[PDB]
Design a protein around this ligand. Structure first.
Ligand SMILES: CCCCCCSC[C@H](NC(=O)CC[C@H]([NH3+])C(=O)O)C(=O)NCC(=O)O
Ligand SMILES: CCCCCCSC[C@H](NC(=O)CC[C@H]([NH3+])C(=O)O)C(=O)NCC(=O)O
Ligand SMILES: CCCCCCSC[C@H](NC(=O)CC[C@H]([NH3+])C(=O)O)C(=O)NCC(=O)O
Ligand SMILES: CCCCCCSC[C@H](NC(=O)CC[C@H]([NH3+])C(=O)O)C(=O)NCC(=O)O
Lengths: 210, 210
């Protein structure tokens, strides 16, 4: 079967889950206890030597790294449920556009969004003090990336074209967390970005992981 | 026709250049003067809103982000020069293996290798003092990534399998640099990694960018 070895609150794990719900696939979430340092010990290390979640299995195929996993799903199960690739998934040029988008959330958006969620959400649970200077700084970085999405979105319905793809999907887990933080202003204040966010988070697959 | 908008000393630009030499493609490297802040103003900003090199053009098609450019090359010019995809490039599973590897070098290797080259190489040109605490630290992170590679390379000739692919190519520029730095001890003291490094560094397309 298809099993995801991960933790339900992690952004990366959620990214896989949504791809799975989008394709309407049956899978099993095998819970890895981050809290007891499970991700840092055998046998988990055997699934991912870099000791991070998620890890994944489709029958005899074993994968780790969430971007790689979602790409595998979009292709292996292409014609099942929602196609997560470009409408013309044969066109290398169209595909190049989406691959830049995936590359961009990875380098520009994600490290920023993750630091911001760590600061305002993870810390909260354990009563740790949020660094106000870090959060103002990271928000400076985010707005910057968001001004880019804003201009892009003034010409295309979604980031990679007129269709929802892996590029948009990849941004859901982190945005869902930031929307319940005062960082939501950066999304709400930019018209085209706000609407884009409304669309991707209102999807039922997106809703299935919160 | 095909042009690279970058800097010949950049690790990300050399990554695109090696792909082209590998495909036996003719191209123009249009020099973007980083030292003059050329990358942070128009019209470069219209080729890459994030203001980073390289950017790329193949006819009407414009791209940025080196990982996305080298995959474009590997596919669009698939049956030409070297095969940078797996021997069986249609195989979804084999491609998954290669993709995980490209992701690992992006997340685990690159930040580390990049910081180590900035400290020991970049700072040197300006007489800035290389911080040795950071070097020691970052080196500790690299050692452990290379330990993973040593295990893998004991199984397969290359990282994604028995063949040289985009997964390997992507590490060349950073390795070329650190080999002229005292970090080369890390590569050389690891037998399989040592052979692997020599294999991929002695390739003509690799040598044409040094
Ligand atoms: C309840 C709040 C949940 C989200 C908290 C973000 S926690 C900090 C955590 N940091 C890391 O895992 C460090 C490794 C880094 N994510 C990498 O990929 O190299 C993270 O980025 N995690 C990202 C993730 O969950 O995938
Ligand atoms: C109650 C809230 C708990 C929130 C936990 C979030 S941590 C998840 C984190 N995973 C990652 O960073 C995975 C990133 C990886 N690049 C991918 O996309 O798969 C991890 O394993 N980090 C461990 C490490 O980096 O060592
Ligand atoms: C003179 C030999 C120098 C070799 C080391 C390059 S210096 C560091 C350089 N850093 C950047 O470009 C900054 C990236 C980005 N601005 C950030 O937020 O970190 C880099 O990694 N650049 C990546 C690249 O070279 O493409
Ligand atoms: C002696 C100088 C020669 C070495 C200069 C290296 S800087 C190159 C750097 N480019 C990148 O980091 C590219 C990263 C991008 N993720 C990619 O892979 O294309 C850049 O433009 N950085 C500018 C920035 O990020 O602000």
């Amino acid at each position: 079967g298809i099993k995801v070895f991960g933790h339900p609150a992690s952004i990366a794990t959620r990214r896989v889950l949504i791809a799975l719900h989008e394709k309407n696939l049956d899978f099993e979430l095998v819970h890895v206890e981050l809290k007891d340092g499970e991700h840092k010990k055998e046998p988990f290390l055997s699934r991912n030597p870099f000791g991070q979640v998620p890890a994944f299995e489709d029958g005899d195929l074993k994968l780790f790294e969430s971007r790689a996993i979602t790409q595998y799903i979009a292709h292996r199960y292409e014609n099942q449920g929602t196609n997560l690739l470009q409408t013309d998934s044969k066109n290398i040029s169209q595909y190049a556009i989406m691959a830049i988008g995936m590359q961009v959330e990875d380098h520009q958006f994600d490290p920023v969004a993750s630091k911001l969620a760590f600061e305002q959400i993870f810390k909260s649970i354990y009563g740790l003090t949020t660094d106000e200077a870090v959060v103002a700084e990271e928000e400076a970085k985010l707005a910057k990336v968001l001004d880019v999405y804003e201009a892009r979105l003034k010409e295309f319905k979604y980031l990679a074209g007129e269709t929802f793809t892996l590029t948009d999907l990849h941004h859901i887990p982190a945005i869902q967390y930031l929307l319940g933080t005062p960082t939501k202003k950066l999304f709400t204040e930019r018209p085209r970005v706000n609407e884009w966010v409304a669309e991707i988070t209102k999807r039922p697959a997106s809703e299935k992981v919160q």
